[PDB]
Amino acid sequence: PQAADIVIADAQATPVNHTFVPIGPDPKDATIYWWEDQSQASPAGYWRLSMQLVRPAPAKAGQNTNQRMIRVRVSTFEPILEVAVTATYSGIAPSPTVSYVPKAFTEFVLPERATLDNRKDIRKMHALALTTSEAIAMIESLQFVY
Amino acid sequence: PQAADIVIADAQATPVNHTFVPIGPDPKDATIYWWEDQSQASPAGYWRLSMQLVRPAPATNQRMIRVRVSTFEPILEVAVTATYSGIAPSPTVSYVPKAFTEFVLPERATLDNRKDIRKMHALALTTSEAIAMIESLQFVY
Amino acid sequence: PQAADIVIADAQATPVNHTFVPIGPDPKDATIYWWEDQSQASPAGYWRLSMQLVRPAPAKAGQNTNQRMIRVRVSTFEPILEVAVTATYSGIAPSPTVSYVPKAFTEFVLPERATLDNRKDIRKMHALALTTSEAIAMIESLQFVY
Amino acid sequence: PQAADIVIADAQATPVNHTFVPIGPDPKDATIYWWEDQSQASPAGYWRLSMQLVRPAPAKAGQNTNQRMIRVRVSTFEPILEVAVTATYSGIAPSPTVSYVPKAFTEFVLPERATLDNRKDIRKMHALALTTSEAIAMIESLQFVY
Amino acid sequence: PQAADIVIADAQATPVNHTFVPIGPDPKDATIYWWEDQSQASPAGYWRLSMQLVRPAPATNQRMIRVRVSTFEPILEVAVTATYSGIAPSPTVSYVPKAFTEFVLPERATLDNRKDIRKMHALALTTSEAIAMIESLQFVY
Amino acid sequence: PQAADIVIADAQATPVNHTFVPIGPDPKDATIYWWEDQSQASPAGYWRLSMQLVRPAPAKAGQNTNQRMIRVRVSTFEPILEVAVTATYSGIAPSPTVSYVPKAFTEFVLPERATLDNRKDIRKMHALALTTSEAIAMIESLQFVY
Numbered sequence: 001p002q003a004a005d006i007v008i009a010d011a012q013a014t015p016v017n018h019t020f021v022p023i024g025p026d027p028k029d030a031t032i033y034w035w036e037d038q039s040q041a042s043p044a045g046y047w048r049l050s051m052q053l054v055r056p057a058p059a060k061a062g063q064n065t066n067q068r069m070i071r072v073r074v075s076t077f078e079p080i081l082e083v084a085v086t087a088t089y090s091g092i093a094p095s096p097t098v099s100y101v102p103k104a105f106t107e108f109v110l111p112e113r114a115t116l117d118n119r120k121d122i123r124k125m126h127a128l129a130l131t132t133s134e135a136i137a138m139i140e141s142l143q144f145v146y
Numbered sequence: 147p148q149a150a151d152i153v154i155a156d157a158q159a160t161p162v163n164h165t166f167v168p169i170g171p172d173p174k175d176a177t178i179y180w181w182e183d184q185s186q187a188s189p190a191g192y193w194r195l196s197m198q199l200v201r202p203a204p205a206t207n208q209r210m211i212r213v214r215v216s217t218f219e220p221i222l223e224v225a226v227t228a229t230y231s232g233i234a235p236s237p238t239v240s241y242v243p244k245a246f247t248e249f250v251l252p253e254r255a256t257l258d259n260r261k262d263i264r265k266m267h268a269l270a271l272t273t274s275e276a277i278a279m280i281e282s283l284q285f286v287y
Numbered sequence: 288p289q290a291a292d293i294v295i296a297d298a299q300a301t302p303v304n305h306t307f308v309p310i311g312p313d314p315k316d317a318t319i320y321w322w323e324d325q326s327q328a329s330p331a332g333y334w335r336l337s338m339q340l341v342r343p344a345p346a347k348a349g350q351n352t353n354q355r356m357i358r359v360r361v362s363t364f365e366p367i368l369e370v371a372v373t374a375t376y377s378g379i380a381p382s383p384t385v386s387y388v389p390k391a392f393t394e395f396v397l398p399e400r401a402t403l404d405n406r407k408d409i410r411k412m413h414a415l416a417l418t419t420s421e422a423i424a425m426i427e428s429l430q431f432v433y
Numbered sequence: 434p435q436a437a438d439i440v441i442a443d444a445q446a447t448p449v450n451h452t453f454v455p456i457g458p459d460p461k462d463a464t465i466y467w468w469e470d471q472s473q474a475s476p477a478g479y480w481r482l483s484m485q486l487v488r489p490a491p492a493k494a495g496q497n498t499n500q501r502m503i504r505v506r507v508s509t510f511e512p513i514l515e516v517a518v519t520a521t522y523s524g525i526a527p528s529p530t531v532s533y534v535p536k537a538f539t540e541f542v543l544p545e546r547a548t549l550d551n552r553k554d555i556r557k558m559h560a561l562a563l564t565t566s567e568a569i570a571m572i573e574s575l576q577f578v579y
Numbered sequence: 580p581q582a583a584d585i586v587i588a589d590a591q592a593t594p595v596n597h598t599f600v601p602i603g604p605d606p607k608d609a610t611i612y613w614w615e616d617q618s619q620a621s622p623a624g625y626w627r628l629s630m631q632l633v634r635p636a637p638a639t640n641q642r643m644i645r646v647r648v649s650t651f652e653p654i655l656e657v658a659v660t661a662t663y664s665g666i667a668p669s670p671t672v673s674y675v676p677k678a679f680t681e682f683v684l685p686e687r688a689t690l691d692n693r694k695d696i697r698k699m700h701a702l703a704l705t706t707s708e709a710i711a712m713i714e715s716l717q718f719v720y
Numbered sequence: 721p722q723a724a725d726i727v728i729a730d731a732q733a734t735p736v737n738h739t740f741v742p743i744g745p746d747p748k749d750a751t752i753y754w755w756e757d758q759s760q761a762s763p764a765g766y767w768r769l770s771m772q773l774v775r776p777a778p779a780k781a782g783q784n785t786n787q788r789m790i791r792v793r794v795s796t797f798e799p800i801l802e803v804a805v806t807a808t809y810s811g812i813a814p815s816p817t818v819s820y821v822p823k824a825f826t827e828f829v830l831p832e833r834a835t836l837d838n839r840k841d842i843r844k845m846h847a848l849a850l851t852t853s854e855a856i857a858m859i860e861s862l863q864f865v866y
């Protein structure tokens with residue numbers, strides 16, 4: 001697929017669509033690509049999304065492939081800003097800094113011999129496992145299972 | 147909340163519900179809990195789901211709560227019709243597609259921040275780009 | 288030109304279009320770009336196409352040009368996946384393995400000195416030379432000229 | 434196929450047919466045959482075309498074939514003759530000298546195991562890959578894909 | 580944005596549009612992208628334009644985004660009418676006027692700050708003083 | 721030209737003219753001159769502009785000049801202030817400090833043998849290249865080209 005905007009909904013009372021515009025490929029790794037939500041107050045607080053596909057070297061004739069594997073990594077960074085003062089004096093506006101950065105990192109290990117069905121299974125089922133009542137209780141409510 | 151069955155839909159043409167029964171906490175680590183789908187051929191191929199919540203000790207602006215959700219879907223080898231000796235081998239695992247997701251949530255982060263990161267990452271796994279990368283194995287250009 | 292799908296016709300009775308989706312630039316070498324035909328049986332057997340442009344470091348003031356040269360390499364790989372038969376030692380069918388790989392490699396050496404007309408000439412005339420009755424007889428029917 | 438003239442069109446505004454008369458097999462290597470375009474200014478600048486078929490020694494009884502391979506190499510050389518200017522040291526105009534040589538080299542690796550369909554596929558699809566808009570942009574306009 | 584032709588006007592009596600076709604990213608550095616004006620005599624004299632955007636890695640109040648715009652306008656030597664041997668030399672570059680501009684933009688800097696620095700520097704290159712220094716080679720006294 | 725005020729327009733909705741009064745030559749380098757926009761809240765936040773012309777030593781009789789070069793450097797500094805509190809208590813006003821400094825540095829390398837036409841070309845065309853839609857997308861919108 002081509003590089004396009006990626007739109008993801010907020011978790012507010014009335015959800016707000018955040019649009020991640022593609023920034024481009026990573027400077028140092030050609031296998032990871034970067035989108036950015038530039039709606040925040042300064043770039044220090046912009047939210048970032050990165051997707052990475054790592055393919056193995058092409059198979060050789062007669063080579064045994066049951067150990068070659070493909071990796072996919074999705075990563076989201078949502079830095080939160082803070083400000084030292086909330087007003088503006090004599091044209092000097094408050095300049096926010098980063099306060100903390102919640103983030104998430106997901107990695108799929110897909111062995112090259114796997115079926116399209118296996119890949120659809122692992123993708124759908126993991127994405128669903130992130131939305132189970134237990135997952136919500138652990139990530140949002142910070143309560144383990146007893 | 148108390149641990150109970152976790153039901154997750156298949157990705158077949160007609161989806162099939164897989165029910166992960168709670169097995170219990172990991173003997174080595176009390177922070178990670180295991181559910182298991184026992185519908186497969188033999189227990190070596192049972193699908194597994196682990197959820198882990200690591201809270202820092204009660205007490206310093208670098209204190210972060212971690213949450214790890216992991217899904218393993220091992221695929222067993224099909225029953226053999228013939229071997230060199232005539233005795234069928236033990237059930238063996240052919241390959242294992244798996245997934246590992248980790249949330250890093252600073253202790254200062256508000257409930258709104260946590261809801262945001264969870265919803266938005268889960269959605270980021272279902273984008274057209276994510277589906278092209280994981281299912282069709284295509285990069286973005 | 289922005290990277291896009293490359294569609295090339297088969298050589299069957301009724302030609303079948305193969306669509307090569309870009310994978311992207313080689314992480315090991317940035318001067319070579321990769322498209323992949325995902326219509327095969329499993330990824331190890333996906334056909335691939337690679338195009339490489341190697342331009343020399345820019346000319347310097349008073350420098351001598353008469354040896355600086357540009358290279359372009361187009362390569363196509365069409366690996367044929369092995370078809371499984373009954374495995375008798377373990378009764379476990381083997382991982383998908385590549386049986387053999389028919390491939391082609393074309394390299395243009397274009398000296399920087401050369402004119403656009405020279406480059407158009409060499410490209411067109413070589414691409415035609417690959418379609419001559421003699422080339423067809425050598426590659427397809429394995430016959431020399433006498 | 435008996436050796437005969439090979440006629441290939443130019444890339445000019447009005448294409449001009451170049452006729453390559455066979456010179457014959459290379460005396461040093463019998464598996465490579467040579468045609469020559471004699472329309473240039475003097476023989477040193479005659480364009481040349483070479484086709485090579487390397488078939489392996491015949492399969493032997495009980496021998497293993499899985500590595501034996503056939504190679505076909507088509508090569509085109511279009512040397513550009515230097516245009517003379519006034520010689521000032523001796524006042525004697527120089528012998529015809531080749532200024533630079535744009536050239537192209539294509540090698541097909543066809544494993545003996547491969548079927549006629551495989552060979553037709555690789556030949557047609559590579560010859561087409563040399564005519565894609567991307568190949569035209571790289572060879573003629575010196576632009577990569579991004 | 581996707582890369583496309585960049586058209587820049589000459590400084591002739593009647594200006595002439597030079598069209599810089601995108602060549603692509605630099606093989607050595609993925610952060611710098613190259614356009615090329617191919618209207619000159621031979622490729623050694625093609626005019627070039629490079630734009631580079633260096634973002635710091637996602638993660639500390641000394642984190643700065645850099646942007647470098649560079650223009651090269653090499654001037655080739657004219658075709659020779661006579662040499663010592665009678666063979667004309669390969670196209671050679673006589674001299675190269677060039678320009679290099681670098682923006683240092685702290686990550687805390689707001690869109691207004693970035694618009695200010697870009698507009699104001701670009702204007703600073705067109706002041707009467709700048710024109711006297713670059714074109715007429717005169718200092719201010 | 722004489723040292724005079726330099727007036728440059730803001731990028732606000734309704735642009736505001738900033739007037740850079742000449743401060744004078746640099747203390748340590750006699751080849752770089754300094755203007756300053758003193759409209760800001762305290763000198764820590766004043767905006768500065770510097771122009772530098774570096775000429776080579778005069779040519780010697782019979783000396784070959786194809787390596788001597790002239791450099792011109794224009795530099796703009798726009799520090800942004802921040803304040804700890806926005807009101808005044810008991811006659812104590814808030815005193816701002818510097819928060820961050822966006823800046824820009826441009827260097828022309830003009831070989832001494834270059835024509836007035838070459839210099840006008842490089843000046844105009846670079847100044848224009850700073851205002852292209854791509855330059856605006858990269859500096860203001862922080863998006864690379866893909």
Ligand SMILES: [Ca+2]
Nearest residue numbers: 287289579866
């Ligand atoms: Ca692109």
